[PDB]
Structures are given as structure tokens and as C-alpha cells.
């Protein structure tokens, strides 16, 4: 299955948290393709910015094996 | 995101200025157009499916895109493309109500380009599809609203290109 | 190289033969 | 604003704006002209409102303007007035927006924590805002005053 | 009591014994049995492995708290130790795993399957019958995996744990009835079915002679 | 209703109702008397609206009233009219509530799945609702018709 | 939850009846009351913290409950008690706007007795605290509002007991 | 949970009493026992695997339970049983250090009987296995330690039965 | 207690108690006799400590014992002293336990919320505890005082 | 993370060397410092809120940052800034006890610059705030402690810049 | 170490160190000089500890050093001794740290996997550590011996 590598930065604008939230704030991660559309939306609603997207695994424009 | 009203407020808040006559005039300009926008939004929402069908017919399908080797070949990819069309329409409607394009930047344009580049989605065709939606919408909404609606579609298209 | 082990190990093998003891349940 | 809030709820449900939500937008744009007038009145009288409210607050609570109190001394008293002015400006923004969203982001989130560091007493601050409401109400027309009151009340509730 | 300084008299307790103690209502234990774990890239392997073991013990109900090797998933663990995936994405992989499906989906009925989902990810009992119905409709129309994806994607999930925190047992209390329910699901509903169908135990032979 | 929706959003935020949300309730209670009148008009004209809309739909789409079509035959044609009546009743409920929440549970959730089992074509159903809107609009006053339009449009949007 | 307007609608929907004049009269009744309720709700929200403080002073504090061994002894338990008070106040306000007691049954009242019994929270004292809040609220809201406010507070108290 | 020191403190806190000599004597008693307990705990931890093996040999294995049809038949069930034994041993050790059985009631004993009944795990045999562990532990720890150790094992057994 | 804390950490790790953790338990049991003596001293001098600390606090902050202040009036002043007595009792429990767990559950969790309802100023409360430490230190031996200091400091840290 | 004791051990383990007298001397050096460090840490924890207030007064507040259009403007941003200050103080205290700067790199410093750049937080001002805290801390802890404390504050500042 | 463990718990709870946590650090740093002495003694007598324990092990398990056995041959025998030396070094690290973190990362996590591949019998490596304990304990004072014993026992437990 295809996988995306994604970097994003997310701010907490509704509340101020005491515990260390750095891992949540800047998070490079690998996302299954079928999950990414939801995960992009989520970052956008939070008012995070998506710094980078690359397709780690899978071939562009492949009809099968996807 | 920000709308017309909050755009003014934020601009004054950073200066720490109380709202003045100039500010008040801008706000008044929005308030007077508001009722028209609401009517336009209702029209688009009710005709949303039709708008996307018409726009695809005019700009995407019956083409090499839908034929083997094309990006919108396979049911899977056709479905993905008309899914994206639906969001563009919905977000443009939100922008038109808001009277601000910020939401388009925050929740549509951001990371769309990068995703599209990795996929290889053809930008010109997409922009063509956005432009096609614009043309369709203009008819339905009428004189009151057509100009206002159009600018947000144009904003989306220019962002991709 | 484990040189100290190499000479000590052969010294141990030469001093005593393990091949007769047999395991003891104890 | 009203608009922002409606759009945000729709976006969460991933739906077009409801008939009810559309109606609320229509009502707000009709109200807008009146709202702008209310805001203008308060803006014009702002210097007076802040000053009078400060007076009343200090009369109600001698302590804040006393050697123990935070407000004590000229510089400190000025800062306390500056704070009142900030909150008044926020309220005006709120009235034109038709929602406390503008107010809330700038003034109500983290306010407890900020004041606790400063060591300013929060209940006194709330009293100052109450004071400001009373002054503002007098200048405003009765109908206008009620509208303005809600926004003032929200602040008082948040700073508690 | 006069002659007694008033500040002493106000602190006195008339009830004496037969009065409630610090471990009476919620109690001291359930708090402090809750550890937030975050994996750090820099962290030592011994620190990382304590957090990984906690994931296994919340999501697969490993009471003993140290996964048996067959239960482990190694490729995911290596990506987690490499910091290529988040704790959230590791938890998603576990639920899509076959050990999850055999231990928790296949023996149970869909309404109980949903209860176990919320418990395993989310830390709580299902909030409402409306919550149960949505997840049951996911299970029936789409996978177990699609239901696993929904809870982890859920806003509740993202507020309490986000991407860094390993899920924990949390007994909410915010919605009505949830504190009771979440005590019953985390404290009394030990698992009571066998995952495997084969070699059913005969009732007798209780005593050892 | 407007009320239900506002309370639910506040409860999720675990906050008291916002000044803006309170204002929306005030506006709605003022609107209510007019809304009741609009609903009554539609109720009185209901039998006529349904019949006229039916005719238009059948003229617009020959197929539904054809041997292949689902509507074909007397029983089937009656059922199609019955459905139109149901949707009109829902619209009236929506107008008085000021929100589609009541409508949505009874009519819009699971509608696709229900029609798909029946094999009735969804776009035709939407056309019937559009037809009903046109008839209803003519009976209503222009201002009233706009209000009624939104609710009709929501239905058409949901069945799409 | 369910409100007065929806309650009428639901009753007619199970019958399958279109809305009739008698139904309309019930709806009309709510609409007159509504404006008053909104004003009351705003008063309560602004004075909420004070209401709880006064009610605690009237019933809970300076008592055996606060003294060692009492269920409100320890900061943890004191804080939990005033948290519950706040919930009751917030939900009563919601009910008053709605004009329906149903929401109290669905959200507050369900499971409360059983939870309290397991905790060892004394129900009678809690009821007393609710009654105290009602009195304080009655003063703030004013007489017309107070009657409406009182029924919801009474509904909570009866449910708990 | 509660330990010996905290148990004294809690009893005094409900009274509201400051610590007195009688209370101090109970605390003093614990402090003398403490050194012994620490040594015992280390012994048990090092020999834990052996303890379980010996106890199983004494009660569980070479039995009908291990033979087909028995609960401890199949490798999966055998492994589960020795897993549970290890849990009980670890918690007993914790209880012995704490000097209080509370922890056993909270984590070990909660819902256990009911779960066992549904599973078909035989309670009597489990109890037998706990008693067997106790005997083995008694030897390792030595007599002074054994008395202390015994009560916690007995507490587990009584709970299960 | 030290014991409780050690067990809890082991349970989380799902392990038997580590050699290092066992050593910490050993140290605590050795220290216990000294700890008991320190606690007894403070218990005997309790009435004096509370009274002297109260006086120092009132000198440090005139306001609390003033018409504006919460402590004002006999009953209120007594209650403020009662609170100081409660905190002293907790500190003694803490010293014997060797950890603040006893202190924390009875007195530091929810303390902010409790005091905020009462409207008592938290920083003044902290000052009273600091005052109590100074009195207590004078009675205690230097080594004993250091031990006692930590527990007093924790309280001050927890509520400030 | 790593502490001074473990740092020596790790260096010897990569060499494969058994611990030697020279190594022992470094370990011994830490053990003498340790008592002082513990005292310093307790001072900092008790005065933590004051330290942050004083440092903010010295550098952050009464400045353009607090004034409208500044990063520390708005309550939300003010609160976030003093939260970050508290983090720096807490981690420096941890590092001072540990006797190693590693923990600062592992938790505080890693990713901070990039996050700050996206947020728009001004690094120079933050550094200034850290330096201010150091001076305040120096006074409280006393001179011997201050030297040790200073290096960790300096390490944070250099990392951020 | 003791330090690392304390700090890690505090950081997770996002708090300064408890009085209890501080006390444990104080106790540990007082013990430091004694701990260093225990480590030094064992380091000096390393060759003796390994060798005498080795001899006992070969007596206890003749088979391993037999033509059938895995350990048979001089090279193999050397490796078994080398392993014992490694484990002894680890123990000393543990003693000075006052906890197992160093020991655990270097020598126990993944240990099951490595020896199983080699086919060396672990139900016997533990015995070798027991053997080493007996020798090492005889070179220490009673109080020192007990301290050292814990760390040896931990190793035996971990295998
Ligand atoms: C014939 C059984 C039914 C029918 C067909 C019909 N199709 C279209 C248009 C398109 N059909 C496709 C389908 C595919 N493209 C793919 O990639 C795949 C998967 C391999 C399929 C099956 C596409 C993409 C189109 C779009 C136009 C194009 O060819 O690019 C039409 C015309 C659509 C219109 O609206 O004019 C028709 C009529 N219609 C029926 O009624 C039959 C039952
Ligand atoms: C249609 C006009 C054109 C087209 C579309 C197309 N898109 C994808 C895949 C994705 N589209 C997105 C985009 C978004 N992410 C967001 O956050 C938003 C804003 C709401 C959008 C619109 C994403 C994330 C994906 C990838 C994941 C997914 O499929 O959901 C495809 C599929 C590409 C593939 O190879 O699988 C297609 C075809 N491409 C065309 O040909 C049209 C011109
Ligand atoms: C205050 C008037 C009285 C009081 C209250 C009290 N309650 C608790 C503990 C709990 N309270 C609740 C109750 C609710 N949860 C809900 O969802 C609702 C409906 C909206 C209510 C009212 C719950 C579930 C708990 C337990 C979990 C929690 O703490 O959040 C306590 C404390 C028990 C404890 O050990 O902390 C107390 C003291 N008791 C009194 O003394 C007053 C008479
Ligand atoms: C063995 C021939 C050589 C060797 C290996 C070695 N690898 C690591 C650490 C990692 N190995 C990987 C690689 C993979 N993870 C996967 O999932 C896959 C694909 C299926 C591979 C091949 C990863 C990701 C890691 C890093 C994190 C982890 O531990 O999982 C090490 C350990 C380094 C460390 O200290 O952690 C080693 C030793 N190195 C040699 O000496 C051999 C030449
Ligand atoms: C023979 C190849 C090796 C060997 C075997 C051996 N086994 C035991 C004891 C037991 N073995 C079992 C195993 C099973 N129970 C099951 O349910 C299954 C799967 C169906 C198996 C295989 C059991 C339960 C026992 C315990 C005693 C009992 O049966 O109740 C022993 C005896 C050890 C003892 O001390 O009891 C032995 C020797 N041992 C070898 O070394 C051979 C290589
Ligand atoms: C061993 C002496 C006896 C034995 C044990 C046995 N247990 C199970 C299954 C379970 N064991 C438990 C027990 C616990 N779970 C908990 O949460 C706790 C307390 C916190 C305990 C102690 C549980 C819940 C299970 C079920 C699921 C699981 O294995 O995790 C079995 C296996 C039953 C099966 O059919 O799989 C066995 C064999 N049984 C005997 O015959 C011995 C007398
Ligand atoms: C004195 C330093 C400050 C002060 C105190 C003050 N407190 C009250 C009232 C109460 N104080 C408590 C506190 C506790 N209950 C607990 O469980 C604990 C921990 C063991 C504490 C410390 C409580 C419960 C009350 C409520 C009344 C009651 O006890 O029943 C008052 C009077 C109440 C009022 O607001 O008038 C005061 C004055 N006030 C200050 O400002 C001093 C700095
Ligand atoms: C007056 C009603 C009370 C009072 C006020 C007071 N404030 C300060 C200092 C500051 N106040 C603020 C507040 C704000 N910054 C913001 O962004 C907003 C939201 C828009 C507010 C409200 C700030 C940042 C400061 C710090 C100084 C600065 O602004 O640079 C003081 C000064 C006391 C001190 O510096 O310690 C005072 C007195 N004090 C009272 O007691 C009155 C009840
Ligand atoms: C204060 C001296 C300066 C200041 C700070 C500031 N920071 C933020 C937002 C964040 N700060 C951090 C930093 C950390 N989080 C961590 O986990 C760690 C390591 C333990 C650090 C140091 C993070 C991640 C955020 C984002 C989310 C959050 O709140 O944690 C802001 C707010 C910016 C925004 O718009 O979100 C500010 C103001 N800024 C200044 O001007 C001061 C000089």
C-alpha cells in the first residue's frame, strides 16, 4: 500500500497545556494513503500548517498494486 | 480562519486601536451585501451535485483523462476527483459567505499542492474544473451574487497555478 | 584477542578433565 | 463572529450551511447597522467610560489602591486603567462581530494565569468590568444597553 | 468548648470514628496508577520499552504487563523506535492487526465489540447508545479496521492523547453514567471468554488428586 | 429546533450559552409567530400542493410513470404521492422549529439506503420536492416563500 | 435532549398528524415565555460563581461535612462538591431555556443516585445544596423568571431524592 | 491502596487528631519489621521462576488438569496458568513490603472470582497453587520472614475462595 | 509514603522491586525513628507554632486582617488559623511517611478551586505556611529543621 | 537522558574498560557536589513562580512584546510565554541535579528552533528571558550553587540561538 | 542511575522533584564512596572471580566442556570465560549507578535472542552468575557483600 511522509506544525489556540507538547506540535510521520485525507483535514482545522508531503512508498499513477 | 468582520478587528487589535470611521465603513460594506450572500449559498448547496456533474461534463470527462492512461481513469480515481470537486465547491461557498479568502488558504490550498505534486494530479485540468464550476455557478446564483461568488473560485484557481 | 583467556582456559583444561565427572543432581 | 462560528460548525459536520444557520446570518446582517451605531457611541465616550469606571472600582475596593494592593502608586494605577481600556476595546469588537469569539481569543484565554503571575486579584478586575458596564449603560439607549450588557456580562463571567 | 482556642475548636471533629476517609469516593489509587507515557527519540531503550509495553497492555489487555513475543509486532516496534511513526500510528496498526481481530473481534458480538473498542482505545466505556450504534454500523458495513480507524481519528482521541501519549484507563465522569460504566468496564469486566475455539475444558476435574 | 441546537453546542463546550447564541434565541422567539402562520398556510393547501407537484414531476420525468419505472401502476403512484405528502409534513415541522434537526431524523438519515432498496431513483424524488417548492412558493407571500424555500432546498440537498 | 417546540412536533409525528391549531397554541405559549427565559439565563451565567458560593455558605460549609471525616472534608472532595453544584446550575439553566425537563433526565439524573451511593456522597445534603441555589437564583432572576427557574431546580431535587 | 504507615495516618486524619505516642508505637513496630521484609522481597524476586515451578509440581501438574479436557491442558492454557501464578506472587511481595493487604483487594482480587467462574478456571486448584507457593516461599525467606509472608498468601487464597 | 510510591512504580513497570528501589526502602526504615521524633516535637509545639505563624502572616499582610480582607472578623481569623493548623498536621504526617503523598491527597489537590470559591488569596496562604516553617525551624534542631523544611517547602510550592 | 555517573560508565563501556581510579575520581567529584545541588534544587522549586515573575519584569513585560502587535500580546500568548519560562527553569533544575546537559538536548532543545520559527516566537527575546532567570536564580541559590546552575542556563540559551 | 530514574518520573508528571525523590538522591550520594570501594575491589579481583567461578561452573556442568557439548574446545572455552568477564564488568557499573538501567540496556534486553541463536544454554549462564556471586561475596565485608549481592541476583532474575 502507498504511504506518505508528512511534516506539520500545529499550535494550541484553544487552551494552554502544562505538559510537554513539543512532540504533538512538530511531527514528521508516515501515514497510510487511505488515512491521509482525514489527517490533512485534521491539521488544517487545528490551524496547523502542513510543511511537507512526500509519497514514501508506492508508484505514482499505478492502476494496480495500490 | 477569519471573515470580513474579524479581518478588520484583527487589523485594529494589532495596532491596539479602537474601531474608527474608516473601519466602520468597511464593516458597513460587508453588512449591506450579507443578505445576498446567504441567498446565493442556499442556491449552491441545493444544486451542488448538479453543478459538479455539469462542470465535469464541460471540462473533464469524454476526454483522454477518463480514458486508460489518464489520471481520472478507473472508478477509484474518478471518484477521488469528483470528491475534490465537491470540497472546492463547499469551501468556495464558505469563503463567499465569510467575504474573506483566508479559509481557502488555511483549509484548502495548504498542502494541496504538495499532495498533488506527489500524486501527479494534473493541475491545469483541476484548475479547468474549478473554472468550469465557476461558470456553472454564475448562472444559478444570478446578478446579485455572481460577481461575489466568482472571486473565490478565481482565488482557488490562482492558488493552484 | 582474549589472549589472557586463551592461556588461562588451556591451563584450566590441562589441570582437570571434565570428561568423566557426569552431572550430579545435588 | 457569527459568520465564523456558523461556517466552523458546518465544516466539522462537512455539510453545507443549514437553513437555520443561514437564517441566523441573515438576521445578523440586518442587526449590523444598529450594532455599528452602538459601537460608535462607546468608542466616542471611551475616555470617560474608562475614567469613571476606574473611579467606581477604587471607591468600591479601597484595597487595590492601597500600599498592599497591586494598583497602588501612579504607574500601577495607570496600568490598571490601561487594562480597563483594553477590555472596553474588546467589548466594542464583540458588539460588531455579534459574538465573543474576538473578545475570547484576545482577552479571556490564559487570563487567570496572566493575572496570577502579576498577582493582580481577579475578582477586582471583574468589578472594574462591572463598573464599566454601568457607565456604558447610562450612555446607551435602553435597547442598545441590553445588547451591550450581554458582552460585558460575558467578560465578567470569564474573569471569575 | 470555652477555654479552648477557637481555631482548635473549629478543626475538631464531633463524629470521630465512623467518619469517611481519604480513600472513600474516587479514592487515591486510580490516580497515580495513571502514567502518561511519551516516547522520546533520544530516550534510552529501557525507557522506550516501558512505554511500548504499556501500549500492548492497554490495547490488547495484557494484564501481566509484558507482551508474550507472539503478540508483539516487530516491524511496527522498529519504526516506533526509529521515530518514523507516532504512538498514535502504532496504536492504529495494533488494532488492524490479526491478533486484535482474533482476541477481540471474532469471539464477541458487535455491541460488545464496540464496548471493547472504546475500552481498549479511549480508556472508557461507550458514552451512549448512539455512540454504540454508529460504530456497530461501521463494523457491519466496513471492516474492523475501519472502526479502529474511526476511534483513533475521533476528536475525543485527539484531545486526550493526541499523537504522543499512549492511551490510559481514564474514568471520565463528564457525560452522565460514564463514571459508573467506566468503572465496571475497567475494574470488573475482566475478559471472561476464551479467544480460541479449540479444546474446550471439561467442567469436572476441579480438585487435584 | 434552534433551542436544541444551541444547548447541544454549549453542552459540548461545557459552557453557558454565549451572548450571540442567546441573541439568536431572542430573534427566533420573535420570528415564531410569523413562522406559525407560514406553516398553517402550507398545511391548509397541502392536498393541492401534493397533487400539483405530482403532476409536474410526472410531466418532468415520463420514466417514473412507465412500465420500467418504479412509480408505474396505481398502488405505486399512490405511494409516490404519499411520500411527497410526508416530505411536506416534515417541511412544516421544520419551519416552526427554525431548524432541520427534527426533519433530519425522520426523513434525511438513511433515505438513500431506503430508496436504494426500493429501487426508486433518488434524483426523481428530489425533482418532486422541487416541484412541491414551486407550488408552495406561489401560495406563500414573497417573504414567507423565501423562508419556506430554505427548508425545501435542504430536503433537495439531502436527497442528492 | 428535547425542547418544548420539538416535544410538540414529536407527539404529532408519532400520530402522523399535520400540525393543527391546538398544537399551534402550545407552541405559541412557549414563544411568549421565551424572551423572559433568555434574560434569566444571562443573569444566571454572569452570577454563577457567586450563586454557588452563597449556596455553599448557606448549607454545606461551616458544618460537619467540612469538618474532618465529613464527605466534603479534604480539598479534593470540597472541590468535587462545588464542581457538581456548578453542573446542576448549568443544566438547570439549559432546561429553563429549553422549557423541558427531559434534558435533566437524560444528562443529569440518569445514574446519579447509584453513583452517589457507591461514592458515599450524602444525597440529602446535595438536595439541600440544590434548594439553596434555587433560593439564591430566585433573587437574582427576579419573580417572573423565578417561577420558571424553580420548577427545573425542583425537578433535579426530586430526582436525586 | 494503603500501606501500614498510611493506614495509621488515615485513621488519625478521620479523627482529625495529630499523631500521638500510641500511634507512634504502631509506626515504630513497622520500622523494625521493615528491614526483614526488604530482604525477603529480594529473595522472592530472585527465586520467582523456581517458586512457580515447584508450586506447579506440587499441585497443578501430573494431574487430570494437565491431561486432555483439563483447564490446564493445551500449551496456551498452561502458559496462562503460570502467568497468573507469577502475578499473584508479585503482588504478594508488594503486599509484604507494604505491610497491608489492600493492594491485593484492589488489583488482584477485583472481579477475579467471577471471571474465573465464567472461564472455567477451577478455583480450588488455584487456591491450592497459592498455598503451595506459600510453602515454597516460606522455606526460601526463612522463619521470621515466613510468618509475615504467610498472611498475604492466605489473604489471596481466602479472597479467591 | 515511600512504600506506596515504590510499589506504584513497580506495578507500572510490571516488575518486582528493583535493587535500587529496595535500597530506598531500607534507607527510609532506618530514618524512621529520627522522623518520628521530629514529628513529635512539632506536635507538642503545635499551638504555639500556629499562633506565632498567624501573627507573622498578619504582620506581613495587614490586608487579610482588614475589612476588605477575608480573614477580617474573629470567626474569620479563627478559620484562617484553623487552616494553618490543618496544614501543620499534614506536614507532621508527611514527615513520618517520608513523602508528601499523605499531604498531597488531603490538602494540595483541588486546593486552588476551594480557595477560589472562598475567595481567600492563595499567595497569603503560602506566606502563612512559610511563616509556620520559620517558627518550626527555631524549635527544631538544625538537621531536623532541614528535613522539616523540605515538607514545608513542598506545601508552599503546591499552593502559591 | 544521561547523568554524570552514567556518562562515565558509558565512556568506559565503549572502550570495554573496567572502571579505573581516574574514572573513579570523576565519579567522586560528582558525589561531593551532589549535596549542594540537592539544596539548590529545593530552593528553586519553592521560589519558582517568583523567579519567573522577576525575570519577566526584568526583560519581557513593560515592553513592545506585551504591547499590541507584540508576540507576548493577548492573554493566550502571555500565558504561553510564562509557561515556556517555567519549562526552561524546571529542565535546568533537572540538568543541575543530573550534572549533565543531555536532558536539555533530548527534551527542551530538540525541535524547538523549528517550532519557534513556524510560530513566530522571537528567539532573541526568549534567550534574554532565560538569561534573566539565571541572574535571579543565582541570587536565590547562593554563589557555590550559582556557578553550577549558570552553565545549564547558558547551555539552553546557546541551543536556542 | 538513581538520578536518572528520579528525574524521569518527575518529568513525566511535569513536576519538580518530590521531598521523597530528593531524599533518595541524598542517601545515594552519601553511599557513593562506599559504592566506589565495592566496585574497586571487584575490579581488582576480576581475573580471579571469573576463573574460580569458571572452574566451579565446569565442575557443575561437565557436559558443556565435553566433545558433545557446545563449550568444548579451547577457543569456545575462552569465549565462555570472556562472557563471564563481560558480565562481571556490568555488575560493577550497576553498583556505582545504584540501579540497573546501565546493566539492563547493555546486557539483559535482547539477551534471550542472542544466546538462543548461538545455542549457548542460558539455563546455565544464570548459574555462572550465581557462581560469580559466591566468589565476589567472599572478597567483600558483610554489609558491602549484601549490596553487591542484590546486583548479582538481579542478573540471575533477568535471565
Ligand atoms: C452502460 C452499461 C450504461 C451506461 C454507460 C455510460 N457511461 C458513461 C460515461 C462514462 N462511463 C465511464 C466509465 C468508466 N471509466 C472507467 O475508468 C471505468 C472503470 C474501468 C469505467 C467503467 C466513464 C469514466 C465515463 C465518463 C465519460 C467518458 O467516457 O470519459 C455514459 C455517458 C455519461 C453522460 O452523462 O453522458 C454512459 C451512458 N449508461 C447506461 O444507461 C447504461 C446502463
Ligand atoms: C479532480 C478535479 C482532479 C484529480 C483529483 C484527485 N485527487 C486525488 C487524491 C487526493 N486528493 C486530495 C486532496 C485534498 N486534501 C485536502 O485536504 C483537500 C481539501 C479539502 C483536498 C482536495 C488528497 C489528500 C488525496 C490523496 C488521498 C485520497 O485519495 O483521498 C486523486 C487520486 C490520485 C491517486 O493516484 O490515487 C485524484 C485523481 N485528479 C485528476 O485527474 C483531476 C484533474
Ligand atoms: C456537593 C453538593 C456534595 C458532594 C459532591 C461530591 N461529588 C463527588 C464525586 C463525584 N461527583 C460526580 C457526579 C456527577 N458526575 C456527573 O456526570 C453528574 C451529572 C452531570 C454528577 C452530578 C461524579 C461522577 C463523581 C466521581 C468522579 C469525580 O470525582 O469526578 C464527590 C467526591 C468523591 C471523591 O472521592 O472525590 C463529592 C464530595 N458531596 C458532598 O459532601 C456534598 C453534599
Ligand atoms: C546486521 C546484519 C547489521 C546491523 C543491524 C542493526 N540494525 C539496527 C537497527 C535498526 N535496524 C532497522 C532496520 C529495519 N527495520 C525494519 O523494520 C526493516 C525492514 C523490515 C529493517 C531492515 C531499524 C529501523 C533500526 C533502528 C531502530 C530499531 O531498533 O528498530 C541496529 C541497532 C542500532 C541501535 O543501537 O539501535 C543494528 C545493530 N548492524 C550490524 O552490526 C550488522 C552489520
Ligand atoms: C521429549 C521430546 C522431551 C521432554 C518432554 C517432557 N515433558 C515433560 C512434562 C510435560 N510436558 C507437557 C507438555 C504438554 N502438555 C500439553 O498440553 C502439550 C500440548 C498438547 C504438551 C506437549 C506437560 C503438560 C508436562 C508436565 C507434566 C504433565 O504432563 O502433567 C517432562 C517431564 C518434566 C517434569 O519434571 O515433569 C519431560 C521430560 N523432555 C526432554 O528433555 C525431551 C527432549
Ligand atoms: C493457574 C494456577 C490456574 C489457571 C489459570 C488460567 N487463567 C486463565 C485465563 C485468565 N486469567 C485471567 C486472570 C486475570 N486477569 C486479570 O486481569 C487478573 C487480575 C488483575 C487476573 C489474575 C484472565 C482475565 C484470563 C482471561 C484472558 C487471559 O488469558 O488474559 C486461563 C486460560 C483460560 C482460557 O480458556 O484461555 C487459565 C488456564 N487455570 C488452571 O487450570 C490453573 C488452576
Ligand atoms: C488563612 C491562612 C487564610 C484564610 C483562610 C480561610 N479559610 C476559610 C474557610 C475554609 N477553609 C477551608 C479549608 C480546608 N479544608 C480542607 O479540607 C483543607 C485541607 C485539610 C483546608 C485547608 C474550608 C473547608 C473552609 C470552608 C469553611 C469550613 O471550614 O466549613 C475562611 C473563611 C471562609 C470565608 O470565605 O469567609 C478563611 C478566612 N483566609 C485568608 O485570606 C487567609 C490568608
Ligand atoms: C485594573 C483593573 C487591575 C490591575 C491591573 C494591572 N495590570 C498590570 C499589568 C499588566 N496587565 C496586562 C494585561 C494585559 N495584556 C494583554 O494582552 C491583555 C489582554 C488584551 C491584558 C488585559 C499586562 C500584559 C501587564 C504587564 C505589564 C505590561 O503590560 O507590560 C498591572 C501592573 C502590575 C505589575 O506590573 O506587577 C496592574 C496594576 N491591577 C489591579 O489590582 C486592578 C484590580
Ligand atoms: C516567552 C519567553 C516567549 C514566547 C513564548 C511562546 N511560546 C509559544 C508557543 C509554544 N511554545 C512551545 C514551546 C515548548 N513546548 C515544549 O514542549 C517545550 C519543551 C519542553 C517548549 C520549550 C510550544 C511547543 C508552543 C506551541 C504550543 C504550546 O502552547 O505549547 C507561544 C505562543 C505562540 C502561538 O501563537 O501559539 C509564545 C508566545 N514568546 C514570546 O514572545 C516570549 C519571548
Numbering used by the authors:
A (entry chain M): 2 to 67
B (entry chain F), G (entry chain H), H (entry chain B), J (entry chain D): 1 to 161
C (entry chain Z): 314 to 339
D (entry chain E), F (entry chain G), I (entry chain A): 2 to 161
E (entry chain 1): 946 to 1154
K (entry chain C): 2 to 160
Copied sentences from the primary study:
A typical PBS contains an allophycocyanin (AP) core—two, three, or five cylinders of (αβ)3 trimers of AP—and a set of radiating rods—stacks of hexamers formed by αβ protomers of phycocyanin (PC) and, in red algae and some cyanobacteria, phycoerythrin (PE). Here, we reconstructed a cryo–electron microscopy structure of the >10-megadalton Gloeobacter violaceus PBS, with diverging, conformationally mobile bundles of rods composed of stacked phycoerythrin and phycocyanin hexamers, stemming from a pentacylindrical allophycocyanin core belted by auxiliary phycocyanin hexamers. The bundle-shaped morphology is maintained by linker proteins, including the multidomain linkers Glr1262 and Glr2806, which are unique to Gloeobacter.
The AP core contains two antiparallel bottom cylinders (A/A′), a top cylinder (B), and two lateral AP (αβ)6 hexamers (C/C′), which are attached sideways to the top B cylinder. Glr2806 is responsible for attaching Rx to the core. The REP1-REP2 arm (residues 280 to 350) of Glr1262 interacts with the C/C′ cylinder residues, and the REP2-REP3 arm interacts with the B cylinder of the AP core. Each triangle is centered at the top side of the C/C′ cylinder of AP. The minimal distances (~33 to 35 Å) between the rod and core bilins in GviPBS were found to be between the PCBs of the lowest PC hexamers and the upper PCBs of the AP hexamers of C/C′ cylinders. Furthermore, the coaxial position of PC hexamers Rx1/Rx1′ with C/C′ core cylinders brings several PCBs of those PC hexamers to distances of 27 to 31 Å from AP bilins. The location of site 2 on C/C′ cylinders, which are unique to PBS cores containing “3 + 2” cylinders, emphasizes the importance of C/C′ cylinders as independent EET pathways and as targets for the regulation by GviOCP3a_β. We conclude that the additional C/C′ cylinders are a unique structural feature of the pentacylindrical core that adds extra EET pathways to A/A′ cylinders.
